[PDB]
Amino acid sequence: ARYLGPKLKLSRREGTDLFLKSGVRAIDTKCKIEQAPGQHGARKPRLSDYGVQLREKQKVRRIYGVLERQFRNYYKEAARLKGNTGENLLALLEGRLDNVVYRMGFGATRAEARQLVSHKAIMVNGRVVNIASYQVSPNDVVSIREKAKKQSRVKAALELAEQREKPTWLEVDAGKMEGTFKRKPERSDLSADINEHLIVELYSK
Amino acid sequence: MLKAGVHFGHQTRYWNPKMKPFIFGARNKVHIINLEKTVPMFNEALAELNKIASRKGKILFVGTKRAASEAVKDAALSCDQFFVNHRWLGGMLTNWKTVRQSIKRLKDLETQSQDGTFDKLTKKEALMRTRELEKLENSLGGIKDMGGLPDALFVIDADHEHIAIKEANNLGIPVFAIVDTNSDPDGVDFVIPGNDDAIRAVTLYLGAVAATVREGRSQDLASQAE
Amino acid sequence: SMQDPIADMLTRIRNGQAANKAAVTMPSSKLKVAIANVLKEEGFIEDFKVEGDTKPELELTLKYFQGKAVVESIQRVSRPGLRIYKRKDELPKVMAGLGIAVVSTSKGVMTDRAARQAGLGGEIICYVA
Amino acid sequence: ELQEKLIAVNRVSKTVKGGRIFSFTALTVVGDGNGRVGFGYGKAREVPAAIQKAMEKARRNMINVALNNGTLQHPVKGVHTGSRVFMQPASEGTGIIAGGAMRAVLEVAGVHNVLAKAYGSTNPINVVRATIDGLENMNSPEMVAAKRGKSVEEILG
Amino acid sequence: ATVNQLVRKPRARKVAKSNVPALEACPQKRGVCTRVYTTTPKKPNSALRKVCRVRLTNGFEVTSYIGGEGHNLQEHSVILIRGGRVKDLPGVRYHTVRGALDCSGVKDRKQARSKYGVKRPKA
RNA sequence: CCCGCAGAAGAAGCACCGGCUAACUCCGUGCCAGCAGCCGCGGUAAUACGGAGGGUGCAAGCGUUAAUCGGAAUUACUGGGCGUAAAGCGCACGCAGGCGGUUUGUUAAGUCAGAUGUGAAAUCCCCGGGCUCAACCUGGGAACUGCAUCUGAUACUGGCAA
């Protein structure tokens, strides 16, 4: 399933930072981002019209941690669902449980927050959920069970997430370690750096 | 990151209060410019330079500062761009209609004095026409090959060349400057809060701009076409 | 040998709009004056005049707003070789609704937008865009 | 402000007494993103000179096209030299889903979402002249209202 | 054209012909492989292409190319046959699936070893 | 299904990297060995063969083969053509077939509108619910592009009369 390799070579192929590490320091200047993704890294390519679409899709999939079969099911769900298709697709990717745990700040990265969700530690609506692909409905409460509560890492990662842009579609308490998923985010609410029509057009091909 | 040059902060007490977003009062009664906010603005500047220089546009580099004098000529003739570093003439851009024939005097006079009548009249006439060439040469030498109105203005001190900024805000040229703490970030479109008076800094900022220009002018698209 | 006088009317309207003529004339009939009446109600054509007693001829003043003509395109849909009848909720909209389709229904010859609020359909005669 | 785009470069020959002497042709479309498009063909002995000819030829050849909310006003055909083009407004079709050499001129025109299908031949020069003929062919409800019906509430309804 | 002519005679569907007449609607077939030999290809290429004749299990006796670099097939050699022509020899329309029954794998392969039937060099 | 124990411990391959098509260098070989879906590579400096490094895609799968549709407007009803590209009978008459000027009246067959019955359930689609989520199951609807009958409309088409 999940990737589990060198998780900053991906960000050097994309060029742009993917926030795949915690961000204690900055982008370290100890990876040489923006100049080389491999051996022929200084050789900058042409990156044609199929290439910009492909690197857009690989960009969003490598941000969120979703594979191609599941991601294509997310496109299909975004296409049957009413309204703007790329907005529905980013709403579905912002509705994954591990992303909601990340954007509460209960894990530093997506893989870490995925490990808290995977190791029966994250509780939603007073119920345990083990699965990183849970779609969180609006007006839900996401919590942390008493076992993995106050174990070094909600403390560390929640201490670190104080500088991370404060996503305003969810309430968070951080002493009770809970958060209400208030409403789904509009396209205007996430960073304007990913380019959705390239992806929707790519699967439209 | 203070990467290689030291661009930490400035003067003491006569800060322009418009730059309240970039201050940290140090123990020596000296301001510290917010270096963790400088870098997003500098990257927002270079992302404009790649666009308007990949337009095949003309950047005009401005800084005198008595210390950043040679860093502009050295760090700007490495590109295909144009510079003003010795004296900023009042109206080189908005009165360029009459700066034009002074450029014609410079080009049309070194044309006469490289081979022509540079000895044919008087030793005193060589002492006049040559002194004219060394007076116009470090006054119009970098702008000599321009022959038009520039598309951008890279100012190294807003407080020192504030009339170049207002100059290229009478007309529609997007200026951007690295400002000091006492400078005024009003006419400047893409403000860069940093060090104006360090030789390391006017190597660093101007060097990275010099990389975005010549690295920005497509050497890749052209190659593909070929 | 003149088996569709309605198409023979529309080709005179189209050839007049091409040839930049002030008026056109065809041998009149009840259906031609009905369809031309619909076109004057819409505003593609001003001033049809039926002028005759035994062998009637109806003329049309052809509109020209700019130097460009007004009838931008005009097709013939229910030709005699292949008649086309539509339901209520299957009536087309020509040029995304800013052209008009002439349909003949049981309440008379009218436009598609007239037949939607009329709540019925029929034989779509032509597409005037 | 201009947002140029190169479509395709072709390598042509002339065949003189000595040998076949090659040159390059470009094909560009430029345009702001409010319904202005110019294509420039351009040809030179070397590739970047050819694309530069195509830029300067494209900039003085623009066509005003009226579009609302980044899409067409009505489905419109188009024809130029055996390249038939059908393109469709697709009100939030969500993707400028056109073929090669039509996607370029459309997204530098400023439409963001069409349903464009290219019939006939698919030569890039003829399909870009066909889509610029279709985009100039398309008119607006104020255009058809100002020449017919005399009300946009009557023309649209 | 002419809808009335289309009513009198309907518009006839084009008829697709299969490229692999050895048994149709079957991904693989199995043969006896009499006369393994070599054939020079057609004109612009020049090599010795190793090709065996094959009498299948349905009565067809087709000819088929042997891929990889060196093989071990001699005249009784029951082998498995998949589709795909070569565009280099006249009439060779099939391939022998390497590493399947007797048409064993290729030695010292490391890349693309699903094709040619070579197992993973562990130890 | 839940609770506890143990320790990162038991768990990553497959295809590709000349263009189409995302991803490049060296070495081995020398129109050989081989590759190939189509163009086509291989004659000593092969980004195309074989190996290594590096990269790209997919992932408990990956690739090849077979088969259907698409792309194919490449059988064109939607939606093509026929001077020279494939294609106008050598030219007519002419039965069946198709199509038919214009006005009035009648009919209501075609056509249109409504209603009723039927078009099984499952399946597709919409709004929900339950399985920790999903796949899956399921409530209600929509739809089932139709057929028959009754009631009307009579602009067009047809039947009849003038």
Swiss-Prot record, chain A:
GO terms for biological process: cytoplasmic translation; DNA-templated transcription termination; maintenance of translational fidelity; negative regulation of translational initiation; response to antibiotic; ribosomal small subunit assembly; ribosomal small subunit biogenesis; transcription antitermination. Changing Y50D: In rpsD101; suppresses a temperature-sensitive mutant of release factor 1, R137P. Not a ram mutation. It holds the Pfam family Ribosomal_S4. Keywords: Antibiotic resistance, Repressor, Ribonucleoprotein, Ribosomal protein, Ribosome biogenesis, RNA-binding, rRNA-binding, Transcription, Transcription antitermination, Transcription regulation, Transcription termination, Translation regulation. SUPFAM superfamilies: Alpha-L RNA-binding motif (SSF55174). One of its GO terms (cellular component) is cytoplasm. Residues 95-155 form the S4 RNA-binding domain. It comes from the Bacteria. One of its GO terms (molecular function) is structural constituent of ribosome. The keyword Metal-binding does not apply. SMART domains: Ribosomal_S4, S4. One of two assembly initiator proteins for the 30S subunit, it binds directly to 16S rRNA where it nucleates assembly of the body of the 30S subunit. With S5 and S12 plays an important role in translational accuracy; many suppressors of streptomycin-dependent mutants of protein S12 are found in this protein, some but not all of which decrease translational accuracy (ram, ribosomal ambiguity mutations). Belongs to the universal ribosomal protein uS4 family. This is Small ribosomal subunit protein uS4.
Curated annotation (Swiss-Prot), chain C:
The keyword Ribosomal protein applies. Keywords: Repressor, Ribonucleoprotein, Ribosomal protein, RNA-binding, rRNA-binding, Translation regulation. GO terms for cellular component: cytoplasm; cytosol; cytosolic small ribosomal subunit. GO terms for molecular function: rRNA binding; structural constituent of ribosome. One of its GO terms (biological process) is regulation of translation. Coiled coil: none annotated. InterPro entries: Ribosomal_uS8, Ribosomal_uS8_CS, Ribosomal_uS8_sf. SUPFAM superfamilies: Ribosomal protein S8. The keyword Repressor applies. Belongs to the universal ribosomal protein uS8 family. One of the primary rRNA binding proteins, it binds directly to 16S rRNA central domain where it helps coordinate assembly of the platform of the 30S subunit. Part of the 30S ribosomal subunit. Contacts proteins S5 and S12. This is Small ribosomal subunit protein uS8. It comes from Escherichia coli (strain K12). The gene is rpsH.
Swiss-Prot record, chain D:
Keywords: Acetylation, Antibiotic resistance, Ribonucleoprotein, Ribosomal protein, RNA-binding, rRNA-binding. GO terms for molecular function: rRNA binding; structural constituent of ribosome. The keyword tRNA processing does not apply. One of its GO terms (cellular component) is cytoplasm. Residues 2-65 form the S5 DRBM domain. GO terms for biological process: cytoplasmic translation; maintenance of translational fidelity; response to antibiotic; ribosomal small subunit assembly; translation. With uS4 and uS12 plays an important role in translational accuracy. Many suppressors of streptomycin-dependent mutants of protein uS12 are found in this protein, some but not all of which decrease translational accuracy (ram, ribosomal ambiguity mutations). Altered uS5 proteins have been identified in a number of mutants. Some mutations in uS5 have been shown to increase translational error frequencies. Some mutants in this protein can partially suppress an alanyl-tRNA synthetase mutant. Belongs to the universal ribosomal protein uS5 family. The N-terminal domain interacts with the head of the 30S subunit; the C-terminal domain interacts with the body and contacts protein uS4. The interaction surface between uS4 and uS5 is involved in control of translational fidelity. This is Small ribosomal subunit protein uS5. The lineage of its organism: Bacteria, Pseudomonadati, Pseudomonadota, Gammaproteobacteria, Enterobacterales.
Curated annotation (Swiss-Prot), chain E:
The modification 3-methylthioaspartic acid is found at D88. GO terms for biological process: cytoplasmic translation; Group I intron splicing; maintenance of translational fidelity; positive regulation of RNA splicing; response to antibiotic; RNA folding; translation. The keyword rRNA-binding applies. InterPro entries: NA-bd_OB-fold, Ribosomal_uS12, Ribosomal_uS12_bac. GO terms for cellular component: cytoplasm; cytosol; cytosolic small ribosomal subunit; ribosome. GO terms for molecular function: misfolded RNA binding; rRNA binding; structural constituent of ribosome; tRNA binding. The modification N6-acetyllysine is found at K107. It comes from the Bacteria. Keywords: Acetylation, Antibiotic resistance, Methylation, Ribonucleoprotein, Ribosomal protein, RNA-binding, rRNA-binding, tRNA-binding. SUPFAM superfamilies: Nucleic acid-binding proteins. The keyword NAD does not apply. With S4 and S5 plays an important role in translational accuracy. Part of the 30S ribosomal subunit. Contacts proteins S8 and S17. Interacts with ArfA. May interact with IF1 in the 30S initiation complex. At least 19 substitutions or deletions in 11 codons can promote streptomycin resistance, dependence or pseudodependence; all but one of the streptomycin resistant mutations (K42R) are associated with hyperaccurate translation and thus reduced translational efficiency. Belongs to the universal ribosomal protein uS12 family. This is Small ribosomal subunit protein uS12. It comes from Escherichia coli (strain K12). The gene is rpsL.
